[PDB]
Each structure stands twice: as C-alpha cells, then as structure tokens.
Design a protein around this ligand. Structure first.
Ligand SMILES: O=C(Cc1cccc(Cl)c1)Nc1cncc2c1CCC2
Ligand SMILES: O=C(Cc1cccc(Cl)c1)Nc1cncc2c1CCC2
Lengths: 304, 304
C-alpha cells in the first residue's frame, strides 16, 4: 500500500540527453538514433528573443555552429532542419543507448514524467500533468530547455513533451517532439495568456478511488448523484465536466472497490461543497488531479 | 521557477537491480561489483515468517538455491552470507553497470529517492523522507522488497535504504545496506509499534523558504520569534524542536531571501496557530516536511 506522485524510471531517457550549444546559448537536446532534437530558440541571443524570425536566424547558422556534446564526447553535425519549434540536428553517429521510442502528442489531463536537465546532464525526475490549459506546473530553471516529458510502456519510451519556456506567471510551456507547442504559446519573449485552467475531474475521482484502495475512506458517504447533477457542481468549482467516456475509464477502479462511479462523484460533490474540514486524503489537504485512472491502476498493480 | 517533489534520476540504480528467488519467494536484489544485496526474508516461506530463526533457515540453503537473474541472464552464486537483515550473495561476475557508490545510514528527517521494483524490474521513482519515527511513507506492493533508497552527489550513488516490510498501519520499514533496520523494527510477521511521528520542522521551514523563492509570499508576516517561544509552539503541534544546528543549515536560504530564520519561524508559528485559511503554498494545502534545506537549494540551483 501507499500512494505517491511516482515518476517512471528515468534511465532510458538519461542515455538520450545531450548538451546543444549555438553561439552563446546552451540547452538540452534529445539524441535518438542519428538525430538530436532541441528547442529552436538555441539559435537566438537574448536580444532577438523579443520577436525572432527563426527562418532568418537559422540561415546564418551552419552545421558546425551547433556544438553537440554527449557526456564528454563531441557529436559531428552533418545536417540541420527546423520542424515547427524544434531543431533536428542530424549527427554522424546513432545513439547506442537509444531505447525503443515513439513520439506522441498527449491529451490535456494526461500525465507524464519529466527529466529536468542542465548542460545535457540530468538533475531530477518528477511526475506532472498536462493542464487543461496546456501548461505544465514543472520545476525548471534557466538552462532546463530541451528537458523532456515521457511515459514508458514496458520497454518503449513515448516522448510527449519538450520544455521550451516559462511564462511570466511561473508556469511552463513546451512542445510535442514534432515542435508543435501545446496550447496557444509561441516561442517569443512576450506576455502570453495561459487561459483558464480547470481541475481534471476524472483524475480527482481516480485519486479518490486510490485513497479507498489504500485505506482512506472517511469521505465515502451514503449519497449518489447523476452526471447532470454532478456537472452542475463541477461547473461551479471550475472542474472539467464528467462524461460517460470518463465513467468508462473509471470502470476498473469502480470494480476494484465496489463503489459505483456516480457514488464516488457524490463523495466528490460533498468534498467540493463542504471542503475537507481539516482532514487529509493520501497525505493531501486538497483534491489531487495529477493521477489518471491508468496511473492509479498501474501504481496499485506494480507494472514494470 | 516551480517546486516539485523531485527524485534523483534513477538510471544508475536501474542498472543494479536484479531478481533474487529462493524456494518459492522472489524479491529484488542490488547488484554492486560482485555482490548481490537483498532482504534476508527471501529464504522464508509465509509459514516461518511468524517467528523466523534466520540462522537455522539459511543453513538449509546452499549457493545454488539463490537464483539471481539480471534482466534475462542468470548470475552464478559462489558465496552467501548474512549481515544483520540482508543477504550478500557473492556472484562470479562484477556488475558492468556498477556506478561509483557508498553505503550510508541517513538520519531521520533526511530525504532520498526510492526506485520501486518488482521481479528485478523498475516500475517507478519517488522522493520521500525518513520519518522521525524511522518509517517511510512509500508506495510498495508485494514483491517490492529489496527496492532501494538513495541519494546522488555528482556521479556517486549513496545507497541508504533497502525496503523490507509493510507495517499493519500501512507504513514502511527497512534497513540500511548493512542490513540494520532503521527504527525498532524486526523482520517478523508481528504487529510492531512505529511510535509517535513528528513533523520535520527544519524541512517545513526550508519549504517555506522555497515558497518565497518561487513567488508564494502570502504567509510572510510582520512578526518574529525566539527559538524558545517557537519551540513551545512546535511542542504543541508535534513538530520537532528547532535547534541552532537547524538555524545554521537554513542560513543559505535565509541569505537568498533576506528573511531571518526566526522571522520565518514566526510565519510558521502563525500558520500552525491559524491554519492556511483555505489558501495554498506551492500547490499544497498543508505544511510540507519532505524537502530538506539541501533539497531546496539543489532544486533552486540546478545541481546535476
Ligand atoms: O523561458 C525561458 C527562455 C525563453 C524565453 C522566451 C521564449 C522562449 Cl521559447 C524561451 N527559459 C526558461 C525555461 N524554464 C524555466 C526558466 C526559464 C528562464 C528562467 C526559469
Ligand atoms: O511486508 C512484507 C512481507 C514481510 C512480512 C513480514 C516481515 C517482513 Cl521483513 C516482510 N511485504 C511487503 C512490503 N511492502 C509492501 C507490501 C508488502 C506486502 C503487501 C504490501
């Protein structure tokens, strides 16, 4: 038993991290096969970050301007291309440590592990969610750009996020591995609206099921609700509307605990309306929404 | 910016994990150099776990009874010895992936990362603290025994914990890598008192400094206190007494923020006496004590 904000083991991703330097800027790159992926703003100086014309800036750069270092050894750059907001540096050597991998675009509300890196070296790993507003609440300092988000299924690493920017609000924005920003964000030093965030209702419910599985049951009540009644409450509290797709994904947890999804929704409704009354659930004093139903089942089953 | 419950990158430890089977029991082992370390209860069946005579049970076992598998390949056991509650299986092959390592006994209140494993395969990584009562609040299922806790300084892995047992209370107990249990626990299927836990005051204060560094300042007040006045409040709220050693370790954070340690203590005093009033600090609705002052400085500086 026990429930933690557990990240995937980071080894497979650590072996892909490289340092990419261009001019005066250094950031992280992801070395998979014979390609190094990194944020395209590596070609910028602070001065042109206000309104960069990436196409014009990249034209002044040749393969020899991109210094790519893997640990203590230098990689030879034989090609460079810009795909959306990422650069793809073709190197003459395939990464011997390339795991089985995929590039996936996660949906808002999904979770993933982040391996924060500086100068191509890993510093830590943490689990987080793609917020409904497409930002992530990470922990990133200057130099962390190019750090990636991922999920692991058995031996396959599905890369979903590449860190690019921190908004003035202190929240984080980035792209999928094709360089497409999640959300409306642009790679420019300009104030950008993240937009209204919401609580990921299906995840809170999954975490309430995790709480029951791990012994915390004080919040279980004698009530039930309907999707429509529950969604009126969810709207009032800036929670995402619950759909039958969400109920369907909560099926395994409902079967595991014997608590019908709408009965758990009624517990959530009462917690939203009355608060926790100074009590805790799985060591938290708020409703946690960074565990998907898949995460709860995985952590409670022991998938390696 | 941003503050997360960040674990160390787990790659160096993943390369050490092996599966150890003895009779009908399978658990995790730690392969460093030519030795495999695992909990000694691997030699037990459920029947003798009630009151095991480990010395007598180990006598019925020979090197060939300990099946050690590293991924898909089998290790040849050439020696076996029991050191306290761990078994040391000498194998004929040194682990090629052995990182620079140390065995350290952490102090209560210190933190470390845990790589949860099943059948010698890693499933996840999470950060946790050694509680003042020497238990850890981990996330572990049946088969997780032998999973280890560690810290990383540059390239050196300091192993501090080996998972052994889950108490009836749902909390976790284990040993250092010399097989010495942290706390009063014994490796027996018997109800065992964990003892009164306390909140790690120095860690809460470090986390309050992390909050200020990352922008959350609502809790800062116009007050100050003394160590004696603060400790009267700490006693009332089951917080560990703050000493000058704790104030000294908080020095860097006090200098970074310009907030004197006793002024931060007065903020903590008011938060303890008045609660959060429905507000949050670094996304938490309670006072977090699982970040040491070292962890806050590391996460806010980017040590790789
Ligand atoms: O935000 C940036 C640079 C940047 C500026 C404008 C646009 C773009 Cl794409 C990137 N770097 C960053 C990332 N995560 C975290 C922290 C930083 C700075 C300090 C903390
Ligand atoms: O506690 C045990 C077995 C055991 C019994 C008695 C003494 C000793 Cl040393 C070990 N295993 C375990 C560890 N972490 C987590 C979970 C389990 C069972 C299920 C969850």
């Amino acid at each position: 038993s026990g429930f933690r904000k557990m990240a995937f083991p980071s080894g497979k991703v650590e072996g892909c991290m490289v340092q990419v330097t261009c001019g005066t800027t250094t950031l992280n790159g992801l070395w998979l096969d014979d390609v190094v992926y990194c944020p395209r703003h590596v070609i910028c100086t602070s001065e042109d970050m206000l309104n960069p014309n990436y196409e014009d800036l990249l034209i002044r750069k040749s393969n020899h301007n991109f210094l790519v270092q893997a640990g203590n050894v230098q990689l030879r750059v034989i090609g460079h291309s810009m795909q959306n907001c990422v650069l793809k540096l073709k190197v003459d050597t395939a990464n011997p440590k390339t795991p089985k991998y995929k590039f996936v675009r996660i949906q808002p509300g999904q979770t993933f592990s982040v391996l924060a890196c500086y100068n191509g070296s890993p510093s830590g790993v943490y689990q987080c969610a793609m917020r409904p507003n497409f930002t992530i609440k990470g922990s990133f300092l200057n130099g962390s750009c190019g750090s990636v988000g991922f999920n692991i299924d058995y031996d396959c690493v599905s890369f979903c996020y590449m860190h690019h920017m921190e908004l003035p609000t202190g929240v984080h924005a980035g792209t999928d591995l094709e360089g497409n920003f999640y959300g409306p964000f642009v790679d420019r030093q300009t104030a950008q609206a993240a937009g209204t965030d919401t609580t990921i209702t299906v995840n809170v419910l999954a975490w309430l099921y995790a709480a029951v599985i791990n012994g915390d049951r004080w919040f279980l009540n004698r009530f039930t609700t309907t999707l429509n009644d529950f969604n009126l409450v969810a709207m009032k509290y800036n929670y995402e509307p619950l759909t039958q797709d969400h109920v369907d994904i909560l099926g395994p947890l409902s079967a595991q605990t014997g608590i019908a999804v709408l009965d758990m929704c009624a517990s959530l409704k009462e917690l939203l309306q009355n608060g926790m009354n100074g009590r805790t659930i799985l060591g938290s004093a708020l409703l946690e929404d960074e565990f998907t139903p898949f995460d709860v089942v995985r952590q409670c089953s022991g998938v390696t």
